[PDB]
Amino acid sequence: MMTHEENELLCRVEGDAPMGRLMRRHWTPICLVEEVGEPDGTPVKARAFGEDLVVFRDSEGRVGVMDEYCPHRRASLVYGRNEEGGLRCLYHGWKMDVDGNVLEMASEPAASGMVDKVKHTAYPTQEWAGMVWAYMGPKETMPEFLPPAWAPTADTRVSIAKVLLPCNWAQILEGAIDSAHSSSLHSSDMRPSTDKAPRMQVQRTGYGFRYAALRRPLSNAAENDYVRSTVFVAPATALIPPNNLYNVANINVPMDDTNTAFYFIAWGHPSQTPETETWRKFLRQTVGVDLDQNYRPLRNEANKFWQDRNAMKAGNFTGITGFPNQDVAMWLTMGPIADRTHDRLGASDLAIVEFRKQMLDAVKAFEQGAPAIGTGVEAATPTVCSFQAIVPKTTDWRTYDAHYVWL
Amino acid sequence: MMTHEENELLCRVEGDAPMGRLMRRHWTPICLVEEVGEPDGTPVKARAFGEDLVVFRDSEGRVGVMDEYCPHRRASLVYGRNEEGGLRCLYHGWKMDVDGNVLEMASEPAASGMVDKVKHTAYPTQEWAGMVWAYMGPKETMPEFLPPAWAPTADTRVSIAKVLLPCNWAQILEGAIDSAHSSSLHSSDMRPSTDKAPRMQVQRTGYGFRYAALRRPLSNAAENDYVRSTVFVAPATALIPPNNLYNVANINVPMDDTNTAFYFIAWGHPSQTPETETWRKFLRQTVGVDLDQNYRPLRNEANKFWQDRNAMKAGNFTGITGFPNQDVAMWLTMGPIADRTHDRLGASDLAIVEFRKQMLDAVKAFEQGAPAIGTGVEAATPTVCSFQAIVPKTTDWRTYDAHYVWLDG
Amino acid sequence: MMTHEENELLCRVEGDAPMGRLMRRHWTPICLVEEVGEPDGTPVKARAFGEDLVVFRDSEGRVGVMDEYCPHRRASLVYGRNEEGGLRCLYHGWKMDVDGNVLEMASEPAASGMVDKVKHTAYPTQEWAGMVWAYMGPKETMPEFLPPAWAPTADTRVSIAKVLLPCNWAQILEGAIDSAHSSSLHSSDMRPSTDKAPRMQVQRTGYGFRYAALRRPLSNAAENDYVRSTVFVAPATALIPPNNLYNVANINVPMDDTNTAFYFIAWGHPSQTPETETWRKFLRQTVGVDLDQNYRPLRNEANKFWQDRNAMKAGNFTGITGFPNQDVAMWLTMGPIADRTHDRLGASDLAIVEFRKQMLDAVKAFEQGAPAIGTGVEAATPTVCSFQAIVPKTTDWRTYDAHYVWL
Amino acid sequence: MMTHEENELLCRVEGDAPMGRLMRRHWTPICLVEEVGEPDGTPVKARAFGEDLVVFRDSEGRVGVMDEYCPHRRASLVYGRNEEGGLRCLYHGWKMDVDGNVLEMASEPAASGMVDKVKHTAYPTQEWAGMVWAYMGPKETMPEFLPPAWAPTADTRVSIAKVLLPCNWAQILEGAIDSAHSSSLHSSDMRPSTDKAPRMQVQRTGYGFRYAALRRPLSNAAENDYVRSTVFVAPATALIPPNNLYNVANINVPMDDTNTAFYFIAWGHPSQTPETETWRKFLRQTVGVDLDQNYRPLRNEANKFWQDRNAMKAGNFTGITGFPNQDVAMWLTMGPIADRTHDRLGASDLAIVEFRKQMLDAVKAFEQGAPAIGTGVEAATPTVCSFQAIVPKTTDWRTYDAHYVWLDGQDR
Ligand code: FES
Ligand code: FES
Ligand code: FES
Ligand code: FES
Ligand SMILES: [Fe+2]
Ligand SMILES: [Fe+2]
Ligand SMILES: [Fe+2]
Ligand SMILES: [Fe+2]
Secondary structure, three states: OOOHHHHHHHHOOOOOOHHHHHHOOOOEEEEEHHHHOOOOOOOEEEEEOOEEEEEEEOOOOOEEEEEOEOOOOOOEHHHOEEEOOEEEOOOOOOEEOOOOEEEEOOOOOOOOOOOOOOEOOEEOEEEEOOEEEEOOOOHHHOOOOOOOOOOOOOOOEEEEEEEEEOOOHHHHHHHHOOOHHHHHOOOOOOOOEOOOOOEEEEEEOOOEEEEEEEEOEOOOOOOEEEEEEEEEEOOOEEEEOOOOOOEEEEEEEEEEOOEEEEEEEEEEOOOOOOOHHHHHHHHOOOEOOOEOOOOOEOOOOOOHHHOOHHHHHOOOOOOOOOHHHHHHHHHHHOOOOOOHHHOOOOHHHHHHHHHHHHHHHHHHHHHOOOOOOOOHHHOOOOOOOOEEEEEEOOOOOOOOOOOOOOO | OOOHHHHHHHHOOOOOOHHHHHHOOOOEEEEEHHHHOOOOOOOEEEEEOOEEEEEEEOOOOOEEEEEOEOOOOOOEHHHOEEEOOEEEOOOOOEEEOOOOEEEEEOOOOOOOOHHHHOEOOEEOEEEEOOEEEEOOOOHHHOOOOOOOOOOOOOOOEEEEEEEEEOOOHHHHHHHOOOHHHHHOOOOOOOOOOOOOOOEEEEEEEOOEEEEEEEEOOOOOOOOEEEEEEEEEEOOOEEEEOOOOOOEEEEEEEEEEOOEEEEEEEEEEOOOOOOOHHHHHHHHOOOEOOOEOOOOOEOOOOOOHHHOOHHHHHOOOOOOOOOHHHHHHHHHHHOOOOOOHHHOOOOHHHHHHHHHHHHHHHHHHHHHOOOOOOOOHHHOOOOOOOOEEEEEEOOOOHHHOOOOOOOOOO | OOOHHHHHHHHOOOOOOHHHHHHOOOOEEEEEHHHHOOOOOOOEEEEEOOEEEEEEEOOOOOEEEEEOEOOOOOOEHHHOEEEOOEEEOOOOOEEEOOOOEEEEEOOOOOOOOOOOOOEOOEEOEEEEOOEEEEOOOOHHHOOOOOOOOOOOOOOOEEEEEEEEEOOOHHHHHHHOOOHHHHHOOOHHHOOOOOOOOOEEEEEEOOOEEEEEEEEOOOOOOOOOOEEEEEEEEOOOEEEEOOOOOOEEEEEEEEEEOOEEEEEEEEEEOOOOOOOHHHHHHHHOOOEOOOEOOOOOEOOOHHHHHHOOHHHHHOOOOOOOOOHHHHHHHHHHHOOOOOOHHHOOOOHHHHHHHHHHHHHHHHHHHHHOOOOOOOOHHHOOOOOOOOEEEEOOOOOOOOOOOOOOOOO | OOOHHHHHHHHOOOOOOHHHHHHOOOOEEEEEHHHHOOOOOOOEEEEEOOEEEEEEEOOOOOEEEEEOEOOOOOOEHHHOEEOOOOEEOOOOOEEEOOOOEEEEEOOOOOOOOOHHHOEOOEEOEEEEOOEEEEOOOOHHHOOOOOOOOOOOOOOOEEEEEEEEEOOOHHHHHHHOOOOHHHHHOOOOOOOOOOOOOOEEEEEEOOOEEEEEEEEOOOOOOOOEEEEEEEEEEOOOEEEEOOOOOOEEEEEEEEEEOOEEEEEEEEEEOOOOOOOHHHHHHHHOOOEOOOEOOOOOEOOOOOOHHHOOHHHHHOOOOOOOOOHHHHHHHHHHHOOOOOOHHHOOOOHHHHHHHHHHHHHHHHHHHHHOOOOOOOOHHHOOOOOOOOEEEEEEOOOOHHHOOOOOOOEOOEOO
16 A cells, blocks of 8 residues: 555655656656757747756757746746747847857856856757657766667657646556556457456566566467567656557656656557557547647546547447547546555556556665666666567566567 | 845735835825726726725715725625715625725614724725825825826826736836846837947935946947936836837836736827827737736737747747737746746846845835835935936936926927 | 630539539549548538539448438438438438438338339449549449549559638649749749749640640759649649659549539558648648638638738748648639639640630530540540659650659 | 429518418517517517518507618617617617607607608517517408417416527428428437328318328227327418327418528416426527527537437437427428429328418419418317327227317316
8 A cells, every 4th residue: 555655755756856856867758859840940848857948959950958947037938039059038138059058148248257158057958759858867977868669760660649648647657557458448449359357467677667468369268368568668658569560659758746748659660650640640639639739638627538428328438539538538537646545456456566666666776876777787778679469378478589560 | 146035025015025014105006097987987806915906986086995895794895886975785785985984784773883883994095197096004104195207297198008917026127127128128129229238327316226228329439328217216116218209107016926017108298198099009008909808918828928930030039019018928937926046147137136135125124114215205206207318428327417208308 | 815605614513514514424532431431430411513412331331422412301311320221311211222222211101112213313432542432424424433543553552631622623723734833832832943934835635635844954954854744634633743752643523613622632652652641731731720620721811821921021932831722822812713704824824725725625525425535445544644854855755754653 | 293483482471472471461470578578678670571670668568560670761770779668769869659650750850740750660569478479461451369279378388499490481381290200300309109100181171281190009009090180270380299298389480581480389287388498498499508699599500400420329310409409400401492393202291292282272362362371260269279199090080079288188
């Protein structure tokens, strides 16, 4: 049984919070590449770990991620002019480059003490797989940026739905490591199985854990299992089981203690992996249709996530369209921070139990001096993958030589 | 560098707050005269210093400013019947006059002495320069109402834009004593200088301070300065440099700790000064177009103050229309109470630093029992004015004998 | 100069108007396959040549295209129940199959054999390339359905934007055979040339014509021509010059005399050709963003097609987003039926002149009993293709051996 | 098969049109009582047979129905002041009484000979059964006003849904003389029968016709019939079969050739008949929810009458809420004026066939000088009533001694 205090430790990320300090030891997505446009594009507002950030791509094509508020008198830089190699605040014309250097102050003299040497909070960035990433941890702790398990290479197609969700990251992450839920919630959105009650096994690792959900297959149940294996990559990534054509990953980024940037990714061979808008349409996460311009969902508690009771009477399980929308209805109705003090977990919760244990330990150990889970030598790499396959009851799923879906 | 505690002391006005108590030693604008209409007109809701007020113009034409909540069981009087010399609560028919006497209790037997016992809290009021004013301090401290420096007399055209802004008053006031910002923020809304970096000087006074921004003028920069002088009139009024035709003033009234009634005033000779709707259209502060019926801006953070990025690519500096809306975008994005603990000020902030020093000092002194800054003998006058002028480098600006713009210059 | 009577002959299609009789000798797109759904799906409203149609996919997966009004008392069958092998009107329960046989009249005695005697107007249909096609000509004139030039085969990716436009088809058609327009209208959306004034050459065929716009190339304009060839496929199809990756076609179907279903198609090899939603987003034709649910544009004359004057001052040519929406602005402002009586045509209009001449000749010939242009032996095939290429000055562009783009 | 010319003759009512003339020989509902308010109430805009009307209740409680446009320069009197025994035009202050007499002209010299010489077109009116009625025919043809069949007495509860529909009156009327439609269209809205194909029989009368829909009952089907008898009262009223508690009638007033005021009425003993808002909610014809403030439906073609495809997949027949909205979807999708030249009518259409033949004869006869159908000693009275009952096959339904539903199971 978790305690109130453990819940807080697990979930809070703003400012002081140990869990944030840990998370900030990993490279984090801040926003989509598509949001920042061309050189001199419109500046973008973002939010990670309780901090408001401005993101902008300068004349040379470099992407900056900085504190949103001007270093001078803290007007929002989102309104500023992005040109001639920096972002210029509207108010008194201080201009910053993408590394946070103040290149100029319109109403100030000279250069030696205030003009150049003043440095606006700004983080290292990278662009990869359709996202802008930043390292928001102590600077001297920044590792080399390496390909995530779900975007191994410059030629993988990566297609992203982003949805800003008004609840804490941990209940969303839990929903990616919860194989049984597909067999209820997603049962109108379907495998060689109808088994609703899979056996769970978890293998902890240095970066998180891998787990397998074992279902009785429709044929030769005596002989084999339907294995679906998911990878938990700490702090807040799941590699969930692929389909026959492409892979699927979830990364979640805490905007603050009660909001999360949810990224749902189709990835694989370009000829077998949907493009962005196809993927969004399939998921019902189309900007302008399912989401507003800020990728916030139009489905909400007051319209019951557009649930359709007549669809449900007709045999549609949830009456909610777009399987992630079905997920969201469940997560948001748990409240801004799910109260895990009131859970009644079961066999199906095994990987969620492992998540809670592992992450609580990892944050206490980190606070006492260990490496942040999944950093340095520990890291997951693209050798890590989820998969699904009919497997011999006498083969160890943990040693099964599965690779990501390609060609 | 201010502490959190100094920032609280400067900014908070509600209830006890020292700065509220200081500010209430001065007559305060409550709402526009336009809002109260005619005798027996619709009652108006206002808020000052964290109090909800009802304002109304009775059958004899007198304006009352009173606590909004009925003294019986505290239903809002804003819904009541304004007629026959009083405001009558709908609920049980208690009727108050402009001075908060209860004239009548519809359901109370004249038997009891109740009707003459209850007095509703109501403030002394004045109407002047198109505003309803009230005196919200301890009554025995009420001074004679004298004209503001920006409304000298009955023959002055005074044209007002009112905007209710969801931030704290002090960040708004600071935006009025901040000469350098025009040269960036308002650069597409232009004077005989292209100088963006004015050198600043202040002269402290009994009622606040005057400051001058000096810029190199376009011609004869060798021997002359372009002097723009702004007057800070404590607690929260800036006489901003005039143009060639008319004067510009700003008075800010805290509605509470995180909201302010902003009044942006064109005043001068009628023949040279725009009318109200012309001024509002010029500033894009038109009720029904830029503002709702309560004078709240339709521009906001969610719509990004209607900033148009294509206009900015085309060369417009802020892509925001109406110069005060460009100011508002900056003030509001600093958050409901700007955190000055995080400022990094520079040369261009000298008046703002002065303001913080003087007001923190004035509030401390006032708590210790000194008179509230700018009251009694020390009060600003119509002779105090902002000014703009090409001035010889050998003339001390503090010495320039300026008058407020009138006719012919 | 065209006369009023020639303008009407060319443009009108309702009733027995000869041009509509001519067009109905060709298999015609009625709606997209994506509107009709699964077996027993929601019936769809369509309109072609002045007739309101209902389209539905029955329980066996067959598509019907039928007069919209019930043959009983003419209630709309769009509201009917699509199930159990047919479409049943709500009012008295008459049930039709996709061939317009009445299977049952809920309320009629079976004895007075009326159920066998009543047939409902229903048209032969075909599904191909993501569209539902019908043959709306006299029944015995129905030709074998062959693949159109832009959808050669079952392994071609065809991605379709559909827009319902409130003007007559012919002006929309003309817009696809008007090469010089790209060099103005679409100048901010572009090429091997900045020649704004192409010289024009046309070659008539039995199914339409091909033309070439010849531009001065970026140099070697002494040696070469930059050739873009478009193919007019009568009556209302334009195969437009490819890009280096995929092919583009336009087929327009008159809904009536003043409205047109506009189909703008990307087609080619699946790995080089965008998916539907990608195509629609590129063109700003996304349902729910640019279009309402009936595929009508939200851009219109009262909102000036969302023309942004600020973008124009910043150097964007039109201030209108999505190049087809730029064309649409121009077409709809010419009025419901463009008044060709008041054109002042120039050299750039040669292909438009050919079209006017050929279609007026075609329909005049057809009234006197000539086979409809482009039917039978003369019909365009996938060997007929548009192209674009530098063409050393000394070659007949007419002899150029282009194929569509594939890999 | 009707001709185009016969369709036009049956349906058009504006101005000269003979059907318009025929219909105007009957007292006509113009609006609901509840629209006219109290004395000095807000003037009401109404429209019958192609004329725009203003309706107001004056200071003394009387109701006027008059040409909407001021007799002076034709400004709308709907905007005028209703006070001091009259309606005064805002423009130049001409003031008219409910009889159309000009009481005053604000700007005309007191003894300008013009005052008591201008008469504005104003019709005789009657208030009854929660409606304002007017006599819009030639004044010397006006008959005494008698109770409608469906509102026999001052003690009767009458509850009305009014809906302004954008189609011609005749296709709406036909919808009420079409027993078979209920067994399909209204099959999710349901009786001692599941028979979908009633046998039909008609009995012509001097005011219209009665018809009987005969279905096999669910018990003793070989001996007994379930009889639903509807009465058509010309020109545009149907007394529809009652239920066990109360009575149901439809009166339709053409607003012009392509718009119709539809009144749908529950009536009977006050303790057995729902109140107005009850009835409206049940039918989904509530103002502010189903209808705008002018009683126009928010359900339309563009939103497919809010047809819910999922409800249909779950087994609801039409996916449209409130049985009249189901009717309306069918009527309006036939077009502003249904084209009867393209019908293919079967046995179920017998009452509609009869209505078409009867009303085309009546308007032909009338145009040539016969009395208007259903005027005079010929008038339907409250003795005429629809009914529903199980009846032995050996009994003639024409003979069944029906009375309108009243109390318990006893007559009135
Ligand atoms: S607040 Fe940004 S430059 Fe002054
Ligand atoms: S609350 Fe105001 S009179 Fe009672
Ligand atoms: S109108 Fe369709 S079955 Fe009667
Ligand atoms: S128009 Fe009515 S009084 Fe003149
Ligand atoms: Fe899920
Ligand atoms: Fe400003
Ligand atoms: Fe074009
Ligand atoms: Fe019905």
